[PDB]
Write a protein that binds this ligand. Structure first.
Ligand SMILES: O=C(O)CCCC(=O)C(=O)O
Ligand SMILES: [Mg+2]
Length: 263
């Protein structure tokens, strides 16, 4: 289920990571490696993770992508994927994001969880996840594919760490029993007006199903979700482009709001 040589995995990881670190797009890597598999692509992603760890970055969480109809439709792919979150991705509520470090960024409204017990696949179900949730965190992702025109096939996107680049936490961060993640309403405002909205159920029917799916995907590589992991469960709505001068506010039903501005 692999077609890359080890040398190619290491070199592709450097190439793709450099596009992020040096703020430029690249061609879809499947153009040069058309036989590349998902296992190849995740090898590349985890090697990028290793590069970041080796230079001292902490990995502060994981994200699930392409979990909602809206995001599947927008990106043309219907296969859920995951990627990792590095510490310097983090942005404080109300913070300023420097777009000069970004290529062609978009924002997504999500709900995140922090776990308090390990989760393992395979065969992880919704009922296995519930007690492992410590609390929930309103989170806006900034995604920024390193591929030109934000156009990819899923294998390329996995290799590019599922387009991850920034995330903004905010609002009220409460216990799971206090928050219905299925019916949680989310309203995205940009420059003072509503531009997107949705409910948590858009994420695979229930955001906690995304957590179960992540455990199952990780198990394919012998990995799991350690206790204390921050997980972004997926874009509830279509992603919206942002640019210098923009301000955004995402309102979470009963949980306040997350805001940011861009320069
Ligand atoms: O859309 C992309 O470029 C991939 C990132 C997907 C994602 O983070 C989400 O659906 O929440
Ligand atoms: Mg996302």
């Amino acid at each position: 289920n692999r077609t890359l040589t080890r040398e190619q995995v290491l070199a592709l990881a450097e190439h793709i990571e450099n596009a992020e670190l040096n703020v430029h797009d690249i061609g879809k890597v499947t153009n040069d490696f058309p036989e590349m598999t998902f296992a190849d692509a995740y090898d590349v992603q985890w090697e990028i993770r290793r590069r970041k760890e080796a230079r001292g970055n902490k990995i502060v969480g994981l994200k699930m992508g392409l979990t909602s109809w809206a995001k599947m439709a927008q990106m043309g792919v219907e296969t859920p994927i995951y990627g990792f979150l590095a510490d310097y991705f983090s942005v404080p509520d109300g913070g300023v994001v420097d777009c000069s470090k970004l290529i062609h960024p978009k924002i997504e409204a999500e709900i995140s969880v922090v776990t308090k017990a390990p989760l393992h696949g395979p065969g992880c179900h919704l009922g296995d996840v519930i007690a492992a949730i410590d609390y929930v965190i309103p989170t806006v992702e900034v995604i920024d594919s390193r591929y030109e025109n934000f156009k990819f096939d899923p294998i390329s996107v996995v290799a590019d760490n599922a387009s991850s680049t920034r995330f903004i936490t905010g609002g009220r961060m409460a216990s799971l029993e206090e928050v219905d993640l299925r019916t949680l309403g989310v309203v995205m405002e940009k420059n003072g007006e509503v531009v997107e909205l949705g409910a948590g159920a858009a994420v695979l029917g229930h955001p906690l199903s995304s957590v179960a799916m992540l455990a199952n995907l990780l198990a394919e590589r012998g990995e799991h979700i350690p206790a204390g992991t921050f997980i972004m469960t997926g874009g509830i709505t279509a992603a919206v482009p942002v640019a210098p001068g923009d301000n955004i506010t995402v309102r979470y039903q009963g949980l306040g709001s997350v805001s940011a501005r861009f320069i």
